[PDB]
């Protein structure tokens, strides 16, 4: 399905446009700064002072929600291919260190001599989203030890998530991998205990949560995280359930694609 | 009635592309 997501997932706080000419070089650059928020969000339109005759035919790239590092890299871009070398690194590349506003990019080729308006440039988020809804079978439906809202006995880790967010994905994205925990069974000392941030009633877009029945037994678990795209296999979510604990692995897809939302109904 | 010279300041429409959302059932 195509799903527009939340307002936070769609938030645009700045824009950077690059208008390449025929040879994919000499790009005209326009940074539309967040402190000026010309950008017409209510028209979903950027107006530039470059005229039709100045523009001619252009390969138009739009990047949204840059930070200063990414902006400065874009300021130095000379060729279309350079865009595929501009990337942001995140030490812990999952929620919530990856959060709104999300880096986005898109492009379209357009002849401005023919029409002053380019309609339109589709802006594609550079990250992906993973949602696990775990239904627990009877052997796991226990009264949980809860500490500050978290489930001490239920734990998870992200394995082989990529640290890089590319503005434009390289032809074959290389690897820069990390896991959120590396503790081995049975202690799994550094794994993350299950949280309750999703149990709130506006409910954020990412986090962890769970459901208790009337007997106070846990019957379902939920985890939602953002993550970076991967062209290579190995990204995994692992969960530890009370029995040492029982460990379950969910391999994510062989490719994690940008602006895809992978929802799993998991029965354990 | 004369219209403006057809050499206008340019405009770029931008739309935020929907997620592609996929669902899968898995059991253990």
Rg of chain B, Cα atoms, Å: 23 Å
The shape of chain B, in one word, is rod-shaped
H/E order of the elements of chain B? EE
Strand order of the largest sheet of chain A: 3-2-6-8-9
Q: Quickly give the structural class of chain A.
A: mainly beta
Major β-sheet profile of chain B = none
Largest interface pair:
A-B, 52 and 23 residues
> What is the strand content of chain A?
35-45%
Counted by DSSP, the helix tally of chain A is 3
From the N-terminal CA to the C-terminal CA of chain A, the straight-line distance is 26 Å
Q: Beta-strand percentage of chain B? A: over 45%
Let me know the largest β-sheet of chain A: 5 strands, antiparallel
- State the oligomer: heterodimer
Gross morphology of chain A is elongated
Quick one: how many beta strands of chain B? 2
Instruction: Write the element-wise H/E pattern of chain A from the N-terminal end onward.
Output: EHEEEEHEHEEEEEEEEEEEEEEE
The separation of the N and C termini of chain B measures 74 Å
Count the helices of chain B. How many? 0
Subcellular location (chain A): Fimbrium; Cell outer membrane
Family (chain A): Belongs to the bacteroidetes fimbrillin superfamily. FimA/Mfa1 family.
Site (Cleavage) (chain A): 2-3
Protein name (chain A): Minor fimbrium tip subunit MfA4
Provide structural commentary.
The complex is a heterodimer of chains A (268) and B (28). Chain A folds into two domains: 1-125, Immunoglobulin-like (Sandwich); 126-268, no CATH class. Chain A has 268 residues and is mostly beta strands. Chain A is 6% helix and 44% strand. In chain A, a hairpin with a 5-residue loop joins strand 17 and strand 18 (218-228). Chain A has helices at residues 7-10, 52-55, 68-75, and strands at residues 2-3, 15-20, 28-32, 39-40, 45-51, 57-64, 87-89, 104-111, 117-125, 127-135, 146-147, 150-159, 161-162, 164-166, 177-178, 192-194, 207-212, 218-228, 236-241, 246-251, 260-267. The two termini of chain A are 26 Å apart. Chain A is elongated. In chain A, strands 3-2-6-8-9 form a five-stranded antiparallel sheet, with helices on one face. In chain A, strands 11, 12, 16, 19 and 20 form a five-stranded antiparallel sheet that branches. In chain A, strands 17-18-10-21 form a four-stranded mixed sheet, with no helix packed on it. Chain A contains three helices and 21 strands. The longest helix of chain A has 8 residues, at 68-75. Chain B has 28 residues and is an all-beta fold. Chain B has no helices and two strands. Chain B is rod-shaped. Classes of the chains: A mainly beta (268), B mainly beta (28). The A-B interface holds A 1-5, 9-10, 12, 15, 17, 43-53, 55, 60, 62, 64, 104, 106, 112, 116-125, 129, 248, 250, 257, 259-268 and B 6-28. Strand 5 of chain A pairs antiparallel with strand 1 (9-16) of chain B, so a sheet runs across the interface. Chain B: Residues 3-28 form a propeptide. Chain B: It comes from Porphyromonas gingivalis (strain ATCC 33277 / DSM 20709 / CIP 103683 / JCM 12257 / NCTC 11834 / 2561). Chain B: Belongs to the bacteroidetes fimbrillin superfamily. FimA/Mfa1 family. Chain B: This is Minor fimbrium tip subunit MfA4. Chain B: It is found in: Fimbrium; Cell outer membrane.
């Amino acid at each position: 399905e195509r799903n527009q997501g939340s307002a936070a997932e769609r938030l645009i706080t700045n824009l950077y446009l690059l208008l390449f000419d025929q040879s994919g070089a000499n790009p005209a650059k326009y940074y539309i700064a967040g402190n000026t928020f010309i950008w017409l969000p209510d028209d979903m339109k950027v107006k530039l002072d470059m005229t039709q005759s100045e523009a001619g035919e252009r390969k138009v790239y739009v990047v949204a929600n840059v930070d200063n590092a990414v902006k400065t890299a874009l300021d130095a871009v000379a060729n279309e291919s350079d865009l595929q070398t501009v990337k942001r690194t995140t030490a812990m590349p999952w929620s919530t260190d990856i959060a709104s506003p999300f880096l986005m990019s898109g492009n379209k080729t357009h002849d401005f001599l023919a029409n002053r308006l380019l309609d339109n440039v589709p802006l594609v988020r550079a990250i992906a989203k993973v949602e696990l809804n775990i239904s627990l079978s009877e052997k796991f439906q226990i009264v949980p030890i809860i500490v500050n809202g978290s489930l001490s006995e239920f734990k998870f880790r992200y394995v082989n998530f990529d640290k890089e967010t590319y503005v434009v994905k390289p032809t074959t994205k290389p690897d820069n991998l990390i896991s959120s925990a590396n503790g081995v069974w049975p202690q799994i000392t550094d794994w993350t205990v299950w949280g309750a941030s999703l149990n709130t009633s506006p409910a954020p877009d990412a986090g962890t949560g769970y459901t208790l029945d009337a007997n106070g037994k846990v019957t379902a678990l939920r985890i939602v995280t953002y993550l970076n795209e991967r062209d290579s296999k190995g990204a995994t979510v692992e969960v530890a359930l009370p029995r040492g604990p029982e460990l379950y692995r969910l391999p994510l897809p062989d490719k994690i694609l940008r602006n895809h939302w992978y929802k799993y109904e998991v029965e354990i | 009635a004369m219209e403006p010279v057809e050499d206008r300041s340019i405009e770029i429409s931008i739309r935020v592309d929907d997620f592609t959302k996929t669902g899968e059932t898995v059991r253990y």
